[PDB]
Amino acid sequence: MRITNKLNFTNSVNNSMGGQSALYQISQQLASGLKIQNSYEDASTYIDNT
Amino acid sequence: SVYSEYQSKSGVNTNEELAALIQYQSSYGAAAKIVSTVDQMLDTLLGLKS
């Protein structure tokens, strides 16, 4: 087996970046000051609110 | 959002991850190491003419 070691190089960046994105996503809630801002989070609540 | 999504394209090869790979390149220097050992083997080869 061989490619796997090389892709952990790829993967960790993906993993840390995703965690960064989640951190970024949390910061967007700071910007919104809201639980959600669209329907792709929770349409039921989104619709429920409406 | 349109900016952000289309800012994603990378177009040509770009650097977010391509930047990471740069530090890895040194590994070939190890690959070159062996290539030198191959030439050292030529010493064994022509040693047989001597």
Side-chain angles (χ1 to χ4, degrees):
Chain A
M1 318 325 147
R2 296 191 286 204
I3 290 180
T4 312
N5 54 347
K6 303 180 283 186
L7 273 290
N8 321 127
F9 184 76
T10 299
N11 297 115
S12 180
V13 174
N14 297 115
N15 299 115
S16 57
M17 183 278 288
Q20 188 275 331
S21 295
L23 281 149
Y24 191 22
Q25 292 155 258
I26 292 161
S27 55
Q28 296 140 34
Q29 301 316 119
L30 187 153
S32 72
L34 295 174
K35 292 195 188 73
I36 64 179
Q37 297 74 224
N38 204 293
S39 76
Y40 44 80
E41 300 85 357
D42 177 358
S44 81
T45 303
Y46 196 72
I47 288 144
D48 176 77
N49 284 308
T50 310
Chain B
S1 84
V2 192
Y3 181 76
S4 309
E5 61 86 20
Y6 194 66
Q7 200 274 1
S8 196
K9 188 174 174 181
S10 186
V12 74
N13 321 122
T14 59
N15 335 332
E16 295 281 331
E17 281 78 0
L18 184 63
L21 182 61
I22 193 68
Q23 65 81 14
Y24 181 78
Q25 304 297 318
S26 55
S27 46
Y28 183 90
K33 183 166 73 175
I34 304 105
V35 187
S36 63
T37 81
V38 184
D39 211 347
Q40 188 275 331
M41 201 36 48
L42 297 196
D43 291 331
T44 74
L45 186 151
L46 293 73
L48 303 197
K49 179 179 176 184
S50 82

